[PDB]
Amino acid sequence: SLLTEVETYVLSIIPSGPLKAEIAQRLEDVFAGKNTDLEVLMEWLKTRPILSPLTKGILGFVFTLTVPSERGLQRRRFVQNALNGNGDPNNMDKAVKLYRKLKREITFHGAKEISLSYSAGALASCMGLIYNRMGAVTTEVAFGLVCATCEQIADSQ
């Protein structure tokens, strides 16, 4: 089950506490098709205390991927900044190269496999690149990048 892989990977980087429970429920609802309103979800995310900016960027990215329900919605600066990590030459260089590989992919595992060859910083940078143009890659490839990013992150701790 693909969506259960995303969910498990994403939750893995969130520290334990009541906030996590709330993130587990919202993720479950979005991945269940239980409607959703991007605008509302994002405000919520953007305002949660104790959540690392990066983790908000990863969640914001995931909610933007699924539950499109955008309707001309603009990109959230708070997602772009946490993803672009805001500065760090090099890593950005690796991000561009990964972005080029992912563009040739179509599947979740294919994207996930090649992505696991980069560090969390570059992976996050690459997510920031895709976020600028979500339609650059397929939804399955994007999801593959998300997990790898989360895998490398949880491994950092």
Side-chain angles (χ1 to χ4, degrees):
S1 40
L2 180 49
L3 299 163
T4 67
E5 287 192 59
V6 181
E7 184 157 59
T8 63
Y9 271 123
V10 181
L11 293 168
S12 69
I13 71 175
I14 302 162
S16 301
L19 180 57
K20 192 175 184 175
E22 286 194 67
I23 293 180
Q25 206 68 307
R26 279 156 195 284
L27 277 171
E28 181 185 58
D29 291 327
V30 179
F31 286 2
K34 179 195 169 187
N35 288 295
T36 303
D37 176 298
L38 195 67
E39 188 175 303
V40 170
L41 243 190
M42 301 297 266
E43 296 184 319
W44 181 75
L45 262 183
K46 182 179 177 182
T47 60
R48 268 34 263 163
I50 304 308
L51 253 174
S52 80
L54 200 242
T55 300
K56 294 193 182 184
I58 289 173
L59 285 161
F61 182 103
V62 167
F63 294 145
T64 299
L65 199 58
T66 57
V67 56
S69 306
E70 63 166 66
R71 299 188 179 186
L73 287 179
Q74 308 171 301
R75 302 155 195 159
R76 295 287 164 166
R77 270 292 202 175
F78 89 93
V79 172
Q80 288 175 301
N81 303 321
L83 289 188
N84 301 353
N86 294 179
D88 191 332
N90 287 310
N91 250 170
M92 175 81 247
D93 177 274
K94 292 184 174 177
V96 174
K97 297 176 179 304
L98 170 50
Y99 170 86
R100 277 162 153 58
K101 295 179 180 182
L102 301 184
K103 292 180 70 68
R104 303 164 195 161
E105 306 282 49
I106 293 287
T107 64
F108 172 83
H109 291 88
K112 182 182 169 188
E113 211 63 302
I114 50 181
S115 288
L116 284 177
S117 289
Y118 300 72
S119 69
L123 289 183
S125 217
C126 190
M127 282 185 56
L129 278 189
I130 305 297
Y131 188 63
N132 302 324
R133 279 197 179 181
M134 221 61 261
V137 303
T138 70
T139 294
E140 288 81 11
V141 171
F143 271 124
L145 173 58
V146 171
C147 298
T149 307
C150 288
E151 197 179 302
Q152 301 293 63
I153 289 178
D155 185 298
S156 286
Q157 61 188 66

